[PDB]
């Protein structure tokens, strides 16, 4: 197996010089060996990517999936560690930077079909990885406007050169 | 800014909801009564009928079916089309609509203001009439144009005539 | 005096910043204040917060982002209190939203905030060669359908009245100001410094004097957002973006024996309490009428 | 197909294995402090005068019978033991222990402080950055009392020496993220404590190890935290009603 | 029918990352003015409903303890009171339930 | 094509659906407030409304007698229906039952659940959705409109 998301939270940074901007705190957390499915957890993880922790908890409270409760407990635990261990004031000033789901060790069983035939059943297990960063959530990227499209088009025409000329 | 959805009944109180309903109902009654006399406000000039001319239609409500017997003893079946609220909404000129015949837009039965879009409500606000359910376009000739906001009545068709009926049929699904 | 309007704005901001620096330098150390939460939702909550630095907005951020999004006003143990005004002593805090059982204080705060916003729009929507002096913001109840601001224009503006296009432009400037988020900041100053802050508007000086006359300690409540400084009673809303619907309804020229004052009346509703299109048109039609309530 | 998980971690202790040890656990020190010295509440004003502090701190050392018998037992157990040469060694040990915690040099910290003292100075700080320095000493360290605990079952004598220290220290505890957390590194804040050293007398080596770290009850409170702290209330179940204490 | 070729990861991602299959965000979420917990605008508050359900369960348990049989149902109206209460003139003549708990704030006399 | 259908399909058929509704109605009459699936409670709402109307016809009405005998499976509820529910619903025309959607079931099925309750029962009041007070900004502006309208006449 591999365990690096748990050790990613033990790194110590050098002291900041007087005058440097305050670097936001990062908190890594993970839940290992969840009975719920990999792609199904990926759906919930993609749901709460980039929003605030409070909004993610609100969405997971009324999400009907089985993994919604697991992700909500994971987020609550991560917030608790951020408040207690790290010097994270403003416990509502965290946003989910990364939220992914991977696969774990599966179980192989026999699923009978008939006529003496069988298939291999994979009892699935998944791991959930989350990262909370101090600060307001980043703004969502808006679609490119017509002015920007025209600017880019003009730039592509201006960047032309006479190929195989000289 | 994750703004939530808001309807017209969410932030109102038990005392103001009937007040709002009455304030909309009386305005709609007054607006419908204002257009009840179109020929005396500012009628557009009426042109003489030409053999190549076409006429505007209506938007009625299908009530039901009835039997009807003829003087020769035969039995026909008639369908009931009730003209509740027909008003001319907008007028599109010939060259800006098709280049051959102008278009008059006609509205149907009145609906509520609280479930229409902002642009539709703005259009009906500038028109001076309450919103309509079904809005259709009729291709008419240039000599049969009528000022928008004019009401239409079921006596527009006379006993003995042939009409064409357009509607969405009973949808039986997949 | 030969002073550009941008120079006046710069001087006002600089002197306000100096007063703020004096206020923070008044406290040399960071004292810990124990603030109780007396709200209906979470009783017994304790906040160990910094003296003269911490704010009820920071208290709400400690609680949850829902409190920050909903709560407009703070009740510090006996009085309304804006979100961006630092706390002074140990106390108890109760948060107040728009949809509370008795939201009158929040309604008044939003009312004065909208009046100050409209005055900010007016003072800078006029040409430089003409003179504009803001008198005050007449506090009329929420019963009245429009918030009023008193403006004295140049002597040659007494003939014309702003039309639908001018009201349209005023509304556009108000919405542009709404679009950018500008926090409301409350500073407690004295009359001796308020006079030198304004120094130009005779009506504003008279208002400052009459507001300081009732106060034995001669304390003037000043509010500042962006580049606009004005004096008003009580607290204000924390953020500009709270105002969602905004309209400059009408203008009414009231003539006195000394001068003529334009009462600019406008209508606004917040993000939480937005109404339907027809309801908003009805409210605007009502707000078109005269509003007269000074005492 | 028949496969199951393994590695279920549980910590289950029973008295049978805790009593069936072939060898007893070797302890380099005792559990805590036996006799805690309660200082008079007037030291804060007494220390402002030189002789009015030193004369009293000399008299109370000699007039106590328990302290004198303890020091006599220490002399008879180990020669070349002098009280007059103790405070300088204690101050040096204090300075070196603080520098060791600054360095995160756990080996030398282990050699200096004892087993009951190391965890209390490593637990909450092993994940942070410390910048501690020594600048001055307003008052020399004064030996207050000496106590000895003798346990006859193993024939083990543990001697503890209490030294009152008035120190001028500058402390700056940083973050694992490098941001300032506790205090500034240039402020020379004054502090007053009572350090309790322990040394096993039966052991031939017998290093002087710091054991306890006593603060007076009337001492001024520590400096406020730079951050803001929220204290949650009692989590209320739906079927229970809140009661406001008055 | 059997598949002809293995579908690549590009096709798989384009299929199962479409917005139709993604979970939609719910914008009807609001907080309960009574207890401060989360609830939907068209759905009763879970916390307050749980309080009411537990109180109803206790009341029903007591009123069924009053009736020692399964088919012994009162033929008159019923009234529940808490410690420190007395039946009024308009509440007399009905079956009575007495609880040791004090009257809750949400439960009104009426 | 299910145009013009008012009865939804429940249970193992029409008779099983009727039996399920009968059990739900018996429970509702016995306990004065029950909870079930949203569809089941929605369908039971009309039957509970009609049962009170039938009980209001009087005890001596043989048709209502046999209707109650069929529906109320527990026979001790028929006297209760005819002497508690019917007498207390006299001035009311059709406001006999109140239905509210509760959060989804905590079980894995996550069903859409509703609660139905006879009005005027001896149970703690549910957290009904209360409208805003008239002291709100919007409602106060509406009160100003109402005052102007009243003064205009
Ligand atoms: Mg077989
Ligand atoms: Mg497989
Ligand atoms: Mg295979
Ligand atoms: Mg169909
Ligand atoms: Mg079925
Ligand atoms: Zn609630």
From TrEMBL, chain A:
Q: Which compartments does it reside in?
A: Mitochondrion
Q: One GO molecular function term?
A: structural constituent of ribosome
GO annotation, biological process: translation
Q: What is its main location?
A: mitochondrion
Indicate which residues the UniProt annotation says bind Mg(2+): 122
- Presence of the UniProt keyword Mitochondrion in the record: yes
Q: Which UniProt keywords apply?
A: Metal-binding, Mitochondrion, Ribonucleoprotein, Ribosomal protein, Transit peptide
Determine the domain of life of the protein's source: Eukaryota
What cellular component GO annotations does this protein have? mitochondrial large ribosomal subunit
What family is this protein classified in? Belongs to the universal ribosomal protein uL22 family.
This chain belongs to which protein, by name?
Answer: Large ribosomal subunit protein uL22m
Organism listed in the record = Sus scrofa
Its taxonomic path starts at:
Eukaryota, Metazoa, Chordata, Craniata, Vertebrata
Q: Which residues of the full protein are shown?
A: 45 to 210 of 210
Automatic annotation (TrEMBL), chain B:
Q: Which GO terms describe its molecular function?
A: structural constituent of ribosome
Any one GO cellular component localisation term in the record: mitochondrial inner membrane
Major site of localization recorded for this protein = mitochondrion
Q: Where does Mg(2+) 1 bind?
A: 171
A GO BP term here is: translation
- UniProt record similarity statement: Belongs to the universal ribosomal protein uL3 family.
What is this protein called in UniProt? Large ribosomal subunit protein uL3m
Q: Which portion of the complete protein is shown here?
A: 93 to 266 of 399
UniProtKB/TrEMBL annotation, chain C:
Q: Which residues form the TGS domain?
A: 31-97
Q: Which InterPro entries match?
A: Beta-grasp_dom_sf, Pro-tRNA_synthetase, TGS, TGS-like, Thr/Ala-tRNA-synth_IIc_edit
- TM regions (residue ranges): none
Question: One GO MF term, please?
Answer: nucleotide binding
Where found? Mitochondrion
* An annotated GO cellular component: mitochondrion
* Official protein name in the record: Large ribosomal subunit protein mL39
Q: Which organism is it from?
A: Sus scrofa (Pig)
Q: Which family does it belong to?
A: Belongs to the mitochondrion-specific ribosomal protein mL39 family.
Cite the entry's keywords alphabetically: Acetylation, Mitochondrion, Ribonucleoprotein, Ribosomal protein
Automatic annotation (TrEMBL), chain E:
* Protein's UniProt name: Large ribosomal subunit protein bL32m
Biased amino acid composition, Basic and acidic residues: 91-103
Q: A single GO molecular function, which one?
A: structural constituent of ribosome
Q: Which GO terms describe its biological process?
A: translation
Q: Which superkingdom heads the taxonomic lineage of this protein's source?
A: Eukaryota
Q: Which organism is it from?
A: Sus scrofa (Pig)
Tell me where it resides: Mitochondrion
Q: Which family does it belong to?
A: Belongs to the bacterial ribosomal protein bL32 family.
The gene name on file is MRPL32
Cellular component aspect of the GO annotation: mitochondrial large ribosomal subunit
Instruction: Classify the main location.
Output: mitochondrion
As for what it does, the entry says: Component of the mitochondrial large ribosomal subunit (mt-LSU). The mitochondrial ribosome (mitoribosome) is a large ribonucleoprotein complex responsible for the synthesis of proteins inside mitochondria.
**Residues that bind Zn(2+):** 32, 35, 45, 48
- Residue ranges, annotated region (Disordered): 83-110
Keywords tagged on the record: Metal-binding, Mitochondrion, Ribonucleoprotein, Ribosomal protein, Transit peptide, Zinc
